[PDB]
């Protein structure tokens, strides 16, 4: 959270980023699977620009006997393409208020999984990182309307 306005011994903060803790993705990576990762440079409905990341791990199905479940790298290109398309569509159609409200209940993840489950299974899709790059202007009234 980045402090932007300050009044009444308070600090009035706006969404500046989102990360994972390193032990989360280290608790996700296991060998004999492929990690697909995507990142787009998108602009929201404001003049904020975001670099938003995504990671997604290939899954072996139930009744799969062979141990690997690797991706065939054409499937990696197709999955990274559908992921980049769906999160550059989920931004540009959100504000930072609507996008923070979007990535609170992890719902872009279910969008990605439902878009991807006719290429590869792909367990635990995450977004892992949202980076602010450049911000438009101040707009104190919008900040105060975001707070209340």
């Amino acid at each position: 959270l980045r402090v932007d306005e300050v009044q009444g011994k308070n600090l009035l903060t706006n969404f500046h980023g989102m990360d994972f803790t390193t032990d989360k993705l280290r608790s996700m990576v296991r060998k004999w699977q492929t990690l697909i990762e995507a990142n787009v440079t998108v602009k929201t409905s404001d003049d904020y620009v975001l670099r938003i990341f995504a990671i997604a791990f290939t899954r072996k199905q139930a009744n799969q006997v062979k141990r690997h479940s690797y991706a065939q790298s054409s499937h990696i290109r197709a999955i990274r393409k559908v992921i980049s398309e769906i999160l550059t569509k989920e931004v540009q159609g959100s504000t930072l208020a609507q996008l923070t409200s979007k990535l609170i209940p992890e719902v872009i993840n279910k969008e990605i999984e439902n878009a991807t489950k006719d290429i590869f299974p792909l367990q635990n899709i995450h977004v892992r990182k949202v980076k602010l790059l450049k911000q438009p202007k101040f707009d104190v009234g919008a900040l105060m309307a975001l707070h209340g």
Binding site: K102, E111, N114, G141, A142
Partner: protein, 1079 residues
């Protein structure tokens, strides 16, 4: 860079009539200079004789205050006759065919010896000017008496550029030798020699005159009268140099007159201070220089557009008044000094005069921004706007150029009452600083208001209105006992373009507090007095301030002007601004705790509704469902700050009580393929939400409507959750299998129903798919355009009062009302509720459908519609106006980046209602340009109906609805069973829509939907009108395709059964309707 040159050429072709109306007035000036050549001389005499000389003649001699007495005037006059010439605009051949009547200059210069080389004392220079012009006026009157041109010409004393110390004589051609077609007034000033002085006492800071306060108007006016041909000579040198100066002159002076900087004056409380000549000589200054390293920026060869661009860019970006200016030497380059002169400033070393001192600080500060705005609308390569650059006229109107204007009524009486009325200082040093009460009062009132507002306003303008720039032959100056004074006004109008963020900030703080008081804290306390106090804030800050009280009807900037006018200007003056009270009282005041003290920029009722929605939003996400909810997002007008009554808790009959919110579930591949079973699945999800919410969150109440607004699917059952905060929400379900299902209906429809179902899909896209980005952009744009939500609430009350808001869509109203903000050209961004509403009306009148669309981009000032997108929406506009070039079914084309098709929000409304809209637009601006702004003007401007609307059908309702609709003049419950909202709400809107849906071919109906915003102070008065189609004007034979009410009298013809149609109207609405009238 293709149509601007044709704009230049067509502008010159429309302003050039310079072959027939120039020769006759040329030869009339030829006869006039022969007249003054055969005028005779007048030998050396004095004032002691010349007072009784002019005693019992007909022509009086002008003067300035006080009348020069034979004590201090031992002064004598000489009458030497000079050479005549053509000066200024006519000297450089750029006269303009304004029908209001332009000018021409006459050279009556003087010899070096008739007037001594001691012109630096007590204005006897202009006194001998006055006596020379007086006897030349007298003998020109005798010479016209002998040459029989008495009847059609009238020689009148008038003001040379409104200057109270240089009066002149103008011919008015009042009603083979007659003159009644071209321009009227012909000026007569005198001139001086070029060298009558000493160099070291011509700067605007000197003084030698009586009791060392300096005198800018004296040492400027004497040097302006000195220089009337050196200017002409070096302007002829630069005219022989560049071949673009005549076209540059006509262009820039047309710019200046259409934005109001005509060469009147600014010092005397007048909009102006700058003109054609000043523009051309600073253009020549920029031509010869502009750079610190002697950098030339203006090349003496190129075109008119780039010359206009370079000089407007330079005088827009580079400062001249507050810090720095540039000088040039005419007899040649220019330099920049960083030394501000606290006046609009540019200097010579050849004429040694400060030119722009007819302009004041405020008029320069508004000139710089006018140039900057026209620069900023020259540097957009997307649109073409040369109407908005040159052809439009913003200074023809009074309250569109400025957001606020107050009538300072000054009944301050006579000069013996000046001391005991005016609370300021008048005396000797100020009478040598400023000339009169007019220009002193202008400087003092603008300085007092500028200090008392400061950061709450952008720019200030001051108007001594009623200013008479002419006075007849039988008087020496202006005799005017005009409404409580003896001076050249009747009241003042102070005008403000304001900072809308800082209007209703109820603290205008001063500097910080210390042990020893500052000069700034000192002048703060000498200013405010009983308001000046010491306050600590929540952030730990001891500061001096003055805390006001906010009010809805009275913006607190008005109370600041009232306070600092009734204390530091007069003690008995009045301030009048009641149009603002009229507009702010037309906005419905909400039934909220202490809602009369709340300002009009307070959106906290919407914010409280959004907080209740946040609670319900978290409850719906935390409940568990057969699908994960993708996103639940609101789309309501209350969520984009548009709702008419700002929503009170528990207002059943408020039509925008039930707000609309679109929830979508995750992209399931198990949605059905057929539309009615799809909608039964969507409402199955809504029933599951209902059952879980009533089971767990027991304080929430919910029931089901049945929506019919999207046609041909009569089962979109949105549930209506009534929250414990007194709010209601309409929950829709967007699935990804909806748009492709409707596009499928387009694909396999029969070929006579393809525009039918395409209109149905346009309604679906307008409701579900495009309204979401519509409310997103308007919610993000309302925070950068502050007054936009109250001007839309006024505009929608206006539409509902004129009973067209039943048909025209709210989103359409929001886009036509967002036009004066997101592209305001060439007006500024609206800083008033009144200015916003009047500029909405001016745009909807001035804008034409059949040629020009409404392509506008909803963004913040300083993502943009590019040239590609703009030419694309231009292309589909031209395609729509080739498939139908007269607007039969598509009347408005309002289009944005959010929806480039245009037809979305403006489809479906009839051409009768659209013609009524553009007619009421032109009617409103016509009455505003005829009458002017008064309480009765605004009263009729909101007075409904009473025009060629054919029906009047007056209705009631068994209970008033305004305690239960939140416009106050209390319900804080919900009924035990939810079938009582049905009797509480009003039915007239959907009953009229059902009637128009069944009578779509014979007559349109119209009504009002917000019932008691227009229906009296009780809230029951609804009206219905009808308009019969142009097809059903007479008596036609019955067919298969009549679709009307039949009543044949013969066997051939059939007529309407009008009596049966309104009998069944009353049998439909029998408890509600009370009366019927046939216009």
């Amino acid at each position: 860079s293709n149509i601007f040159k044709l704009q230049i050429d067509e502008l010159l072709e429309q302003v050039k009539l310079k072959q027939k109306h120039v020769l006759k007035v040329e030869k009339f000036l030829h006869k006039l200079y022969d007249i003054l050549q055969e005028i005779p001389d007048w030998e050396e005499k004095s004032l002691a004789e010349v007072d009784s000389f002019f005693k019992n003649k007909i022509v009086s001699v002008p003067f300035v205050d006080p009348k020069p007495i034979p004590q201090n005037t031992n002064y004598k006059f000489n009458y030497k006759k000079p050479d005549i010439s053509l000066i200024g605009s006519f000297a450089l051949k750029a006269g303009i065919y304004q029908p209001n009547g332009s000018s021409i200059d006459t050279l009556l210069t003087m010899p070096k010896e008739l007037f001594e080389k001691k012109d630096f004392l007590n204005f006897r220079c202009l006194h001998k000017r006055s006596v020379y012009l007086a006897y030349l006026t007298h003998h020109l009157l005798i010479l016209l008496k002998k040459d029989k041109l008495d009847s059609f010409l009238q020689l009148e004393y008038s003001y040379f550029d409104n200057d109270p110390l240089l009066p002149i004589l103008r011919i008015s051609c009042s009603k083979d030798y007659n003159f009644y077609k071209t321009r009227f007034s012909i000026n007569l000033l005198i001139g001086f020699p070029y060298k009558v002085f000493e160099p070291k006492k011509l700067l605007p800071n000197r003084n030698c005159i009586r009791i060392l306060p300096a005198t800018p108007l004296y040492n400027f006016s004497v040097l302006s009268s000195s220089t009337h041909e050196n200017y002409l000579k070096y302007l002829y040198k630069t005219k022989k140099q560049t071949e673009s100066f005549v076209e540059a002159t006509v262009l820039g002076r047309l710019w200046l007159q259409q934005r109001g900087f005509s060469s009147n004056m600014s010092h005397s409380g007048s909009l102006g201070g700058f003109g054609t000549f000043e523009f051309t000589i600073l253009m020549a200054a920029l031509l010869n220089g502009g750079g610190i390293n002697s950098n030339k920026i203006l090349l003496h060869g190129f075109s008119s557009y780039q010359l206009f661009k370079g000089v407007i860019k330079y005088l827009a970006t580079m400062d001249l008044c507050h810090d720095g200016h540039l000088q040039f030497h005419s007899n040649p380059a220019s330099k920049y000094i960083d030394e501000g002169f606290q006046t609009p400033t540019l200097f010579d070393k050849s004429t040694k005069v400060n030119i722009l001192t007819k302009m004041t600080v405020s008029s320069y500060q508004i000139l710089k921004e006018y140039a900057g705005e026209t620069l900023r609308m020259l540097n957009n390569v997307v649109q073409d706007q040369f109407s908005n650059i040159f052809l439009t006229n913003i200074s023809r109107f009074d309250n569109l150029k400025y957001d606020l204007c107050y009538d300072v009524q000054l009944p301050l009486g006579k000069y013996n009452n000046l001391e005991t009325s005016l609370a300021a200082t008048f005396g000797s040093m100020e009478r040598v600083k400023f000339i009169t009460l007019e220009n002193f009062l202008a400087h003092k009132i603008t300085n007092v208001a500028r200090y008392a507002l400061g950061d709450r306003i952008k720019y200030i303008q001051i108007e001594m209105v009623g200013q008479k720039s002419d006075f007849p032959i039988t008087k020496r100056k202006v005799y005017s006992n005009t409404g409580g004074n003896h001076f050249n006004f009747d009241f003042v109008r102070v005008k403000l373009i304001v900072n809308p963020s800082e209007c209703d900030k109820l603290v205008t703080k001063g500097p910080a507090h210390s042990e020893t008081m500052s000069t700034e804290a000192a002048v703060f306390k000498n200013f405010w007095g009983i308001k000046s106090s010491l306050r600590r804030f929540k952030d730990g800050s001891i500061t001096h301030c003055c805390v006001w009280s906010t009010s809805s009807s009275e913006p607190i900037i008005s109370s600041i002007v009232n306070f600092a006018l009734q204390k530091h200007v007069s003690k008995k003056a009045q301030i009048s601004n009641e149009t603002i009270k009229k507009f702010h009282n037309f906005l419905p005041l909400p039934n909220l705790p202490s809602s009369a003290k709340t300002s009009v920029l307070n959106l906290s009722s919407f914010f409280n509704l959004k907080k209740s929605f946040d609670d319900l939003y978290k409850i719906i996400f935390q409940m568990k469902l057969p699908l994960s909810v993708k996103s639940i997002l609101p789309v309501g007008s209350a969520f984009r700050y548009t709702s008419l009554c700002q929503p009170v808790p528990f207002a059943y009959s408020d039509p925008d009580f039930f707000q609309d919110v679109i929830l979508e579930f995750e992209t399931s591949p198990k949605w059905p393929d057929e539309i009615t079973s799809l909608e039964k699945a969507k409402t199955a999800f809504l029933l599951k939400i209902q059952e879980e919410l009533s089971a767990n969150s027991s304080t929430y109440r919910s029931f089901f409507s049945r929506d019919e607004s999207i046609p041909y699917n009569l089962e979109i059952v949105t549930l209506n959750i009534l929250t414990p905060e007194g709010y209601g929400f309409k929950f829709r379900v967007l699935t990804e299998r909806d748009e492709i299902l409707y596009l499928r209906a387009i694909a396999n429809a029969r070929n006579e129903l393809k525009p039918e179902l395409e209109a149905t899909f346009l309604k679906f896209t307008a409701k579900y798919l495009a309204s979401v980005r519509h409310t997103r952009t308007l919610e993000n744009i309302s925070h950068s355009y502050q007054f936009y939500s109250p001007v839309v609430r006024l505009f929608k009350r206006w539409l509902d009062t004129h009973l067209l808001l039943g048909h025209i869509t709210d989103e359409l109203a929001e886009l036509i009302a967002i036009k004066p903000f997101v592209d305001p050209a060439p007006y500024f961004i609206p800083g008033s509720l009144e200015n916003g509403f009047l500029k909405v009306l001016k745009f909807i009148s001035q804008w034409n459908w059949k040629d020009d669309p409404l392509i506008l981009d909803l963004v913040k000032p300083e993502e943009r519609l590019t040239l590609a997108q703009y030419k694309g929406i231009q292309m589909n506009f031209t395609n729509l106006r080739n498939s139908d070039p007269n607007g039969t079914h598509l009347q408005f084309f309002v289009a944005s980046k959010n929806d480039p098709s245009g037809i979305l929000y403006s489809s479906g409304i009839p051409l009768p209602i659209a013609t009524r809209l553009t007619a009421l637009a032109k009617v409103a601006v016509n009455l505003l340009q005829t009458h002017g702004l008064n309480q009765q003007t605004i009263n009729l401007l909101f007075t409904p109906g009473l025009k060629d609307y054919d029906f009047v059908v007056d209705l009631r309702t068994p209970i008033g609805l305004k305690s239960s609709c939140g416009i106050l003049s209390a319900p804080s419950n919900f009924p035990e069973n939810l079938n009582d909202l049905s009797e509480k709400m009003d039915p007239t809107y959907q009953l009229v829509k059902y009637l128009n849906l069944k009578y779509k071919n014979s007559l349109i109906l119209s009504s009002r939907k917000y019932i008691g915003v227009n229906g009296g102070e009780k809230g029951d008065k609804n009206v219905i009108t009808g308009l019969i189609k142009p097809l059903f004007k007479g008596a036609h034979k019955f067919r298969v395709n009549l679709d009307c009410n039949v009543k044949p009298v013969d066997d051939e013809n059939v007529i309407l059964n009008k009596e049966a149609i309104f009998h069944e109207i009353a049998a439909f609405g029998n408890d509600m309707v009370i009366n019927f009238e046939t216009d």
